[PDB]
Amino acid sequence: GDDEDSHLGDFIEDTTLELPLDSATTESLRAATHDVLAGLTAREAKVLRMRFGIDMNTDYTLEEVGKQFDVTRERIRQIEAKALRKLRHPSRSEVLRSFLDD
Amino acid sequence: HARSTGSYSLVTQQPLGGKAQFGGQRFGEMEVWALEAYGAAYTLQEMLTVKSDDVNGRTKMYKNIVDGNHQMEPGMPESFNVLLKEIRSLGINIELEDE
Amino acid sequence: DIVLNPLGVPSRMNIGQILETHLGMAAKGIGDKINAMLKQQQEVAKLREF
Amino acid sequence: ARVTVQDAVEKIGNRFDLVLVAARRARQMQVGGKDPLVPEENDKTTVIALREIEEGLINNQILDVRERQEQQEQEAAEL
Amino acid sequence: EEFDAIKIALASPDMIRSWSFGEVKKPETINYRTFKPERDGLFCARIFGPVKDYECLCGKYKRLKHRGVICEKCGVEVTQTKVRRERMGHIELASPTAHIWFLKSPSRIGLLLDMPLRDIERVLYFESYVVIEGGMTNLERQQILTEEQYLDALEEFGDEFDAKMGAEAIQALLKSMDLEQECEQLREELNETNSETKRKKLTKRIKLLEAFVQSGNKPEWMILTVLPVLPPDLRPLVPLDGGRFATSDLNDLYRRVINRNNRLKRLLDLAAPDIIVRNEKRMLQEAVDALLDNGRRGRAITGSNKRPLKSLADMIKGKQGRFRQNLLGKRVDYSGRSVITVGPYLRLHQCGLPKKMALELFKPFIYGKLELRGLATTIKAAKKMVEREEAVVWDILDEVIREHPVLLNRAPTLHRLGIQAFEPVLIEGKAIQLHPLVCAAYNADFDGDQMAVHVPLTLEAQLEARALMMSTNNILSPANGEPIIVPSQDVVLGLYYMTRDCVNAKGEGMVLTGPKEAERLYRSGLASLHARVKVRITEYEKDANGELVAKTSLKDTTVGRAILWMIVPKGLPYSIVNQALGKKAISKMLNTCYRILGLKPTVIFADQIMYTGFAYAARSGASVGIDDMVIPEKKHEIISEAEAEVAEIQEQFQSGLVTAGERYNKVIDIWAAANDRVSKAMMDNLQTETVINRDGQEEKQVSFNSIYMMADSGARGSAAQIRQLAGMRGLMAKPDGSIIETPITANFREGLNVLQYFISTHGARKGLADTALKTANSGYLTRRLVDVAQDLVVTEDDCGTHEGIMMTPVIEGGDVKEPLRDRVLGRVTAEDVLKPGTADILVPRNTLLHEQWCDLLEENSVDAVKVRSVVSCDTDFGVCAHCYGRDLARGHIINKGEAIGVIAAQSIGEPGTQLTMSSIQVKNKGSIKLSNVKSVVNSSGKLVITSRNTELKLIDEFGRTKESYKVPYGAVLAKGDGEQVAGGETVANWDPHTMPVITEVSGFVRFTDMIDGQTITRQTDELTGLSSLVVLDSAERTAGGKDLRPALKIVDAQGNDVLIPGTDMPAQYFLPGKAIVQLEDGVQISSGDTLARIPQGLPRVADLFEARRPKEPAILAEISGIVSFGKETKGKRRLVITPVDGSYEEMIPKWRQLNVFEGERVERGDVISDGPEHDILRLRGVHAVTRYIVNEVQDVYRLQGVKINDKHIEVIVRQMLRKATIVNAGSSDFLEGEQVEYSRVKIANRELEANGKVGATYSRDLLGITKASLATESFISAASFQETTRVLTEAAVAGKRDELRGLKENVIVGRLIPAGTGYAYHQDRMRRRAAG
DNA sequence: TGCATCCGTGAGTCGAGGGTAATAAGTTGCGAGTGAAGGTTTTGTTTTGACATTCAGTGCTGTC
Ligand SMILES: [Mg+2]
Ligand SMILES: [Zn+2]
Ligand SMILES: [Zn+2]
């Protein structure tokens, strides 16, 4: 600033916190899923969600899924494919259609 | 010029200057006296906390506008406690007497 | 073309701003004579007269 | 209304309380969403609140008598 | 979260380690290739915080595998980030060094010890030693020892004395001393010898010592041993976009500590010789002060910029820091700028706005409405639907916009009305449309001056933009009772053409039936805008109680005057529109409109005065040219008739008669005496030169010039601006500013000379170099005027206390000046006041004084009445509405909650920008009053006075005065006081050079007490013979009689002194110099004849408020009584006063002229020297103190054409008087001045019936108002704006605290302001303290 | 009661294009640390004895 008005301190941005619009789309991402999880079953919710760690502090895996219900780790991945397939029918992925467009 | 919500600085978490860097305006200290004489208190809380600094305010303002509940939850400016750490830098103890 | 304010004159007091109109209003008047005398095509002898 | 809130001050008695007693009124209808008393006439919530005011319909006491019956009638329901 | 108050004290070095997180030991910040925070570094993760999310550096504890585990290999945790602003670091020094706020400035540490800074500066610079503690009593403490005399103190004794030369040597002097032995021994001898300049240091230390006692501060902490390090979001190290780095300044400054501290603790390990270790501890305080104050102690310190550095305190110092620019004012979102433009079709509450500006600004408000519509599904979907040009985008835009009002702003804000709140209307443009009528509220016009825009997002401020700041809530300005929608240029012109009375128009004389049908006749070409036509109308009055009463009458009126009746809402007479309608009549025609009908018709009315004002100008047309300006032929001869005379006194100047001044003052006159007559040249040639013939021979009427209809309109100027066109344009001058001998003979119609255009720059470039720095001097003056008024908000309805000031006019000087009723208007009466027929008391001790009750006071001839001001109101922390009367802006009874001061601080500092650019005869007949007079019947019959307090005032017979003038001590008159004086009769006469020493007694003269060669000369009159003993002036005469006071004794034939009638005081004139007594010895002089004659702005506003005494104060009379004179010029004359029963002799600069003689009586309230006149606060009351100041600076505005209600200045006089020096003691301290309110507190708890008398009496005090903000109980109100280094030292040595009570305190911290809408909050906060 | 010797303020918004440079030693070991690389290890994922079960591949039986 050639008159005693401005400095280099004015001209730099701190892209650290979040974008205002994008911190809003985090919640609309989150409040999408639980309604999308609401069209499911309780044993069906508990295999797919806590594996990915949604709303839990941890990331459970196929072993901690296996040793708890009974033994099986094989069919839970196949249980989630039925949690994939009925939701990949374009009837409950409308509120997944725009977050698909990230 | 226009700016709804744009970019911010790094030392004081304030909007920026100009039509160039997608900047906000300047609400100068002459205008605060022009605003005090109306007695319009709430806009003076509005035009420093929720529109310049208060980071919990500036999101929960901007999130709540998308709902319609045109409601304020204010706080303290971050340029207030940028002043504390520098007045605390020079061996002076400043603090807050809690209620 | 331009409809502008009259009252910019008397406290700025530019009488000469008015005189930009007065002299040049017949600078058109010369250019309205000859332009009317080229779709008529009299001779050189009137343009050499004018 | 759109032009004037002077008659809204010859009702209450205060220019600044009007900024408060309408805001307390409209916050029950902005997000509380209750029924208005005047017809709408295609207006935002701040305009029906001031049209409520001119006929003497929303006061500081009427904003509290409307809740104090509504408090205990809600507090006669929890048990 | 929420906190009640704050606190500040000196921070202990135990407090610093408890503040911090880890000790910064190495200057490394980032590595040269790996851009990484450094272990044990400045940006260290082990001290200050984490950066990325749950991610350590080397990669051991990640991904929530180990929650609370530090990576012990690298030292770094896993926890939640963004503490890089909250988390401070610290450092432990090796040798302690000194604070520079606590040393350089009194010093405040050497001031504690009464030790000179020069005594410190041999120690803390390592020049010579000083004692710590003499073990033996042979020496004493606080003794500088030079290093060679130190060795003599070594080699004498060795062990019986202790003395260092170090900062520890001062550190030991704070641990050693006690205070309870000192502060009760300063108590012991404060009563011994209380001579002030020794006792004022016994005043300051019993503060300073007992400051530390009851607070808990210790002066050990006053020299640093530990330092705190700023969290690195205050000292960053940022790259640019191009791989280039740019840091804060404090990374450099912090670096100079940690290296230079390191090469001490290493140099200690090697035992460097005792010369070098001194310079080692030298450089620390050289580089510690480099943090605090860069250019303070010695030479400045600059780096590679070759410019000085920004320090730590320079981030809080000046307006470069944070108090003046980043806390009060700020940056802001939701805003923008554009250019203004007019609108002749907007109504007043509306305004224009672009589409592209609002759709870009209201983007958060659209994304809420689209989900309520559902066309957009999610947020990122709705952002996509802006660019795609949906018709619902502009169907939600208007639906967001409607009833959401919007601020507009312009710089410079000069008063309250610079910001307003209109309603939007959309337009297909890119420039902010604006109402034309608000250009009086901004002093602005349309040359591209940009304007800001702002949105009140919350519900509450949107109501403020509708209830408070909506542009139809406030029409009446707080300067006076005339509105601010004075119509500006063409609406004042469109009327003035239309309402007119010529005979030119066809149709004059036939009768019409109604103001509708004039449309059918004037537009058809049977009527004219001005044709004088009889019309039958139907007006309406309110002779009932708020109810319309009809009447219908006929008026021989004009046609264009009748069409204005189509709008006016049936309350005004037809006589109010029966004139030419200039700017004078129109503004009252709004004022009388809302005087009668209330406010809301006058906002509908001014709408429909703007729509007609352009429309009948669009019929009319106003055209100018060169033909409209006419020079009369009386230009050639009028200058030629003086042109023969400019060689005449030049030829006298060749004959050598006339001097320089008598010829210069005559060439300036006759060159301009005809220039006075060039106004008389163009009056009768250009006012009624028109000849239009109409049923007679000719007609003399108004002009057809189309210029004099523009100035009687009020658009630009008056009859002094044509003189620079039609005649010659006055005189000219130099930028030095001396008036020219040869003025101009040309103008703008004929053509000036190349030299007349040369010297024309001189009056014009100066005339713009003047005002371009006269806008700086008011933006100064406003900024401190708003600081004394930062506490002022109403509290209560009534204090109910004693009465106050008295309302009279200011009619001195000439005619009527101010009507009393207008100064009466707006107020509440103080005293029980009546009508001139006795005891018709129109008040119940208080009445609101509106305009109809003002008509009563204009009806009666009575002209004196008392009215409560802010001085007689005595509610603490505010004023009362029963002492304010009318809020001039809102125009009714002032409520509770409003501000007071800042409206006046905006009022008074606004037109400072618009400001800077013999015998006394009777006028008319009436009564005669001249009292407080002691006089005599002279040798000529009439009233000759011999007193100071007398002057002439001219009255009518009723009692309300017309004129008044000062008459001198000793003025000869021609009629008597209490008589009848006709109009035009010469009353007074006096020589201006002499002040007479006229003899009031009658006796013989005798040449006594002067013998030639001692106190006098002999100067006989060689022409006449008549000369008495001629007194000489103060320096020429002999000193042998300079101790003898020279007196011509008035004697009689026996040998006495002829006494004054009434007294036994001897009558002899102790005559000072230059006063030649005329008559010789033995002559009887009369009563009343001269023995001897004694022949001979805006920074002006910045005296009247800045509480400054002049350079030539006119002294008053301290105590009355029979006074003598005193000493003979040992610097100055002294004055021996002996009262009637009472008890002083003091300096007199006797080289000016004194008033009272050696043995004359004086009364208190009389000047003893001449000149201009704090003293009037000291000896007189309180109301007359406010009287001279209010009647001086309001007087300035009348001189340069502004009107301001005098209450606004009276608001400041109350804030000019806050303090009270105290006389006695018993409850508190003795003589230090304190808050007058608190001095009214302790009378009400201890002088009241708890104790008969234990208190202390007190006068009123007066600070300068630039320091009354610095001398305050709050401190951040004083640290926000000026001298931030000083006010944060003294605030911390005492252990102050704040209550956040001022309104500058609630605004910086993000609280709600304690006024207006927020005052109704803050008392619930106030009532929750006393209850819980 | 001066005599000077330093202290410290001078309105307010936008636009403006981008920017630094002086100087200086090598040679020598040896330590701590960025890579590639040993592929084995804890965890994703493949088929077979069989049984309660759903179900489809055999003929049957029954009706209209
Ligand atoms: Mg302009
Ligand atoms: Zn690590
Ligand atoms: Zn009062």
E571 touches E542 (CB < 8 A): yes
Burial of E787 (0-12, 13-18, 19+ CB in 10 A): buried
Q: How far apart are CA E124 and CA E288, in angstroms?
A: 13
Do the Cβ atoms of B70 and D16 come within 8 Å?
no
Nearest to B33 among E230, E335, E906 (CB): E906
Angle among Cα E789, E1174, E1262 to the nearest 5 degrees reads 35
E998 touches E970 (CB < 8 A): yes
Chosen from C3, C7, C14 to mutate, greatest number of chain E CBs within 10 A: C7
DSSP-derived 3-state class of residue E290: helix
C-alpha distances in Å from residue E93, one per residue of E260, E293, E389, E640: 10, 19, 67, 92
Q: How far apart are CA E1174 and CA E1109, in angstroms?
A: 8
Host H or E run for residue E835: strand E834-835
Left, alpha or beta for D6 (phi > 0: left; psi -120 to 50: alpha)? alpha
Distance from residue E237's CA to the centre of ligand 2 (Å): 22
Who contacts E1173 (Cβ-Cβ below 8 Å, separation ≥6)?
E1113, E1114, E1116, E1167, E1188
Q: Is the CB of E73 under 7 A from strand F?
A: no
Ramachandran angles phi, psi of E425, nearest 5°: -130, 140
Residue E951 forms beta bridges with which residues? E966
**CATH number of the structural domain spanning residue E663:** 1.10.132.30
Q: How many CB pairs under 8 A join A and B?
A: 32
DSSP result, E1014-1033: TSB-----SSS------B--
Q: How many CB pairs under 8 A join B and D?
A: 13
Task: Give the Cβ contact number of residue E211 at 10 Å.
Answer: 20
Who contacts E285 (Cβ-Cβ below 8 Å, separation ≥6)?
E97, E98, E124, E167
Range of the domain at E740: 635-777
C-alpha distances in Å from residue E1292, one per residue of E8, E177, E313, E1289, E1297: 6, 21, 16, 5, 9
**CATH number of the structural domain spanning residue E984:** 2.40.50.100
Question: Alpha helix locations (H) across E757-850?
Answer: 760-769, 776-785, 820-824
A25 CA: distance to closest CA in chain E (Å): 6
E423 touches E346 (CB < 8 A): no
Q: What's the first-to-final CA gap in chain D, in angstroms?
A: 44
Ramachandran angles phi, psi of E247, nearest 5°: -105, 165
CA nearest to E290, candidates E255, E322, E321: E255
Q: How far apart are CA E782 and CA E414, in angstroms?
A: 9
Q: How far apart are CA E1267 and CA E93, in angstroms?
A: 39
**D62 close to E (CB below 8 A):** no
Do the Cβ atoms of C7 and E716 come within 8 Å?
yes
DSSP result, E202-258: HHHHHHHHHHHHHH---TTTTEEEEEEE--TTTS-EEE-TTS-EEE-SHHHHHHHHH
Tokens of B83: 């002043």
Q: How far apart are CA E862 and CA E1010, in angstroms?
A: 57
Find residues 361-380 of chain E whose CB sits inside 8 Å of chain B: 361-365, 367-369, 371-372, 379
Burial of E976 (0-12, 13-18, 19+ CB in 10 A): middle
Distance from residue E1317's CA to the centre of ligand 3 (Å): 23
C-alpha distances in Å from residue E1071, one per residue of E1032, E1093, E1157: 10, 11, 8
Q: How far apart are CA E320 and CA E332, in angstroms?
A: 19
CA nearest to E609, candidates E491, E488, E471, E436: E491
* Residue whose CA lies closest to nucleotide F20 C1': E305
Q: At what angle do helices E583-596 and E601-615 cross, to 10 degrees?
A: 150
Q: Is the CB of E329 under 7 A from strand F?
A: yes
Residues 385-414 of chain E in contact with strand F via CB under 7 angstroms = 411-412
E165 touches E129 (CB < 8 A): yes
Question: Alpha helix locations (H) across E616-700?
Answer: 617-620, 636-643, 648-655, 660-681, 683-686
Residue E966 forms beta bridges with which residues? E951
Report how this structure was experimentally obtained: cryo-EM
Do the Cβ atoms of B42 and E1317 come within 8 Å?
yes
**Measured CA to C1', what is the nucleotide nearest E317?**
F8
CA nearest to E1153, candidates E1091, E1092, E1090, E1073: E1073
Q: Where does chain A break, by residue before each gap (C–N > 2.5 Å)?
A: none
Residue E512 forms beta bridges with which residues? E535
Q: For the CA atoms of A37, A38, A44, A50, what is the dihedral angle to 10 degrees?
A: 50
Q: Cα–chain-centroid distance for residue E63?
A: 64
E479 touches E605 (CB < 8 A): no
Q: At what angle do helices E393-401 and E363-373 cross, to 10 degrees?
A: 110
CB contact burial E137-153 (16+ within 10 A = b; e otherwise): eebeeeebbeeeebeeb
Q: How far apart are CA E969 and CA C42, in angstroms?
A: 97
Tokens of E689: 């030169």
Angle among Cα E552, E554, E556 to the nearest 5 degrees reads 155
Chains with ≥3 CB–CB distances under 8 Å to E: A, B, C, D
**Measured CA to C1', what is the nucleotide nearest E1282?**
F9
CA nearest to E1125, candidates E1091, E1165, E1159, E1075: E1159
Residues 40-69 of chain A in contact with strand F via CB under 7 angstroms = 61-63, 66
**Measured CA to C1', what is the nucleotide nearest A78?**
F45
Rg (CA), chain C: 17
E94 touches E264 (CB < 8 A): yes
Tokens of C7: 């009252």
Left, alpha or beta for E1255 (phi > 0: left; psi -120 to 50: alpha)? beta
Distance from residue E1040's CA to the centre of ligand 2 (Å): 101
Q: Is the CB of B2 under 7 A from strand F?
A: no
DSSP A10: G
Who contacts E105 (Cβ-Cβ below 8 Å, separation ≥6)?
E1285, E1286, E1289
Q: Between β-strands E432-433 and E335-341, what pairing exists: parallel, antiparallel or unpaired?
A: parallel
SS (H, E, C) B43-96: HHHHHHHHHHHCHHHHHHHHHHHCCCCCCCCCCCCCCCHHHHHHHCCCCEEEEE
E450 CA: distance to closest CA in chain C (Å): 21
DSSP-derived 3-state class of residue E395: helix
Find residues 202-231 of chain E whose CB sits inside 8 Å of chain B: 221, 224, 227-231
Which residues of chain A have a CB within 8 Å of the CB of E240? 12
Do the Cβ atoms of D3 and E895 come within 8 Å?
no
Asked if E touches A (at least 3 Cβ pairs < 8 angstroms), the answer reads yes
DSSP-derived 3-state class of residue E1176: helix
Q: Is the CB of E749 under 7 A from strand F?
A: no
Task: Give the Cβ contact number of residue E622 at 10 Å.
Answer: 17
Left, alpha or beta for E395 (phi > 0: left; psi -120 to 50: alpha)? alpha
Q: Is the CB of B85 under 7 A from strand F?
A: no
Is the dihedral angle over the CA atoms E59, E61, E64, E69 positive or is it negative?
negative
E603 touches E475 (CB < 8 A): yes
C-alpha distances in Å from residue E314, one per residue of E126, E233, E308, E909, E988: 28, 17, 11, 30, 67
CA nearest to E1328, candidates E4, E128, E175: E4
**Measured CA to C1', what is the nucleotide nearest E781?**
F11
What dotted CATH number matches A17-98? 1.10.10.10
Q: How far apart are CA E236 and CA B21, in angstroms?
A: 21
DSSP-derived 3-state class of residue C24: helix
Ramachandran angles phi, psi of E191, nearest 5°: -85, -5
Left, alpha or beta for E75 (phi > 0: left; psi -120 to 50: alpha)? left
Who contacts E1270 (Cβ-Cβ below 8 Å, separation ≥6)?
E1278, E1282, E1283, E1287
DSSP result, A11-42: S---TTS--HHHHHHHHHHHHHHHHHHHSS-H
Who contacts E1281 (Cβ-Cβ below 8 Å, separation ≥6)?
E323, E324, E783, E787, E1269
SS (H, E, C) E902-916: HHHHHHHCCCCCCCC
Tokens of E1307: 């605004």
Q: How far apart are CA E466 and CA E461, in angstroms?
A: 8
Tokens of E828: 């509440």
Q: For the CA atoms of E1167, E1169, E1174, E1179, what is the dihedral angle to 10 degrees?
A: -40
Q: What's the first-to-final CA gap in chain A, in angstroms?
A: 40
Please list all protein residues whose beta carbon sits less than 5 angstroms from ligand 3, which is an ion.
Answer: E 799, 873, 880, 883
**Measured CA to C1', what is the nucleotide nearest E780?**
F11
Tokens of E157: 């004794």
A87 CA: distance to closest CA in chain E (Å): 18
**D15 close to E (CB below 8 A):** yes
Rg (CA), chain E: 41
B48 touches B57 (CB < 8 A): no
Q: How far apart are CA E698 and CA E549, in angstroms?
A: 45
Tokens of E574: 């037809």
Provide, in whole angstroms, the distance separating residue E281's CA from nucleotide F23's C1'.
Answer: 29
Tokens 């010829």 correspond to E663
Long-range contacts of E1277-1283 (CB under 8 A, 24+ apart): E1277/E790, E1277/E1302, E1277/E1304, E1277/E1305, E1279/E323, E1280/E323, E1280/E324, E1280/E327, E1280/E328, E1280/E1304, E1280/E1308, E1281/E323, E1281/E324, E1281/E783, E1281/E787
Which bases of chain F are under 7 A from a protein CB atom? 1, 8-22, 43-46
Q: How far apart are CA E123 and CA E463, in angstroms?
A: 66
Do the Cβ atoms of E379 and A101 come within 8 Å?
no
Angle among Cα E385, E389, E392 to the nearest 5 degrees reads 75
DSSP result, E438-495: GGGTTT--SSS-EEEEE---SHHHHHHHHHTSBTTT--B-TTSSSBS----SSHHHHH
Nearest to B46 among E338, E357, E461 (CB): E461
Which residues of chain D have a CB within 8 Å of the CB of B71? 27, 30-31
DSSP result, E547-600: --EE--EEEEEEHHHHHGGGTS-S-S-GGGGSS---HHHHHHHHHHHHHHS-ST
Who contacts E1187 (Cβ-Cβ below 8 Å, separation ≥6)?
E805
**C25 close to E (CB below 8 A):** no
CA nearest to B79, candidates E1298, E323, A33: E323
CA nearest to E413, candidates B48, B33, B39, B44: B33
Amino acid symbol at E370 = L
Q: How far apart are CA E223 and CA D31, in angstroms?
A: 58
- Residue E449 known to bind ligand: yes
Distance from residue E871's CA to the centre of ligand 3 (Å): 8
Tokens of E1076: 């030649």
Is the dihedral angle over the CA atoms E10, E12, E18, E22 positive or is it negative?
positive
Q: Is the CB of B21 under 7 A from strand F?
A: no
Long-range contacts of E158-164 (CB under 8 A, 24+ apart): E159/E135, E160/E134, E160/E135, E160/E136, E161/E131, E161/E133, E161/E134, E161/E135, E161/E136, E162/E131, E162/E132, E162/E133, E162/E134, E162/E135, E163/E129, E163/E130, E163/E131, E163/E132, E163/E133, E163/E134, E164/E129, E164/E130, E164/E132
Q: Cα–chain-centroid distance for residue E52?
A: 54
CA nearest to E823, candidates E438, E1208, E382: E1208
Q: How far apart are CA E890 and CA E903, in angstroms?
A: 12
C-alpha distances in Å from residue E1176, one per residue of C45, E432, E1105, E1210, E1211: 95, 55, 16, 17, 19
Q: How far apart are CA E1214 and CA E1182, in angstroms?
A: 11
- Residue E799 known to bind ligand: yes
Q: At what angle do helices E459-467 and D15-30 cross, to 10 degrees?
A: 140
Ramachandran angles phi, psi of E338, nearest 5°: -165, -175
Q: Cα–chain-centroid distance for residue E175?
A: 49
Is the dihedral angle over the CA atoms E26, E27, E28, E30 positive or is it negative?
positive
Do the Cβ atoms of B9 and A24 come within 8 Å?
no
DSSP result, A40-100: S-HHHHHHHHHHHTTTSSS---HHHHHHHHSS--HHHHHHHHHHHHHHHSTTS-GGGHHHH
Distance from residue E1243's CA to the centre of ligand 3 (Å): 20
**E890 close to D (CB below 8 A):** yes
Do the Cβ atoms of B43 and E1292 come within 8 Å?
no
Count of helix runs (H) and strand runs (E) in chain E: 39, 35
Tokens of D73: 């009638």
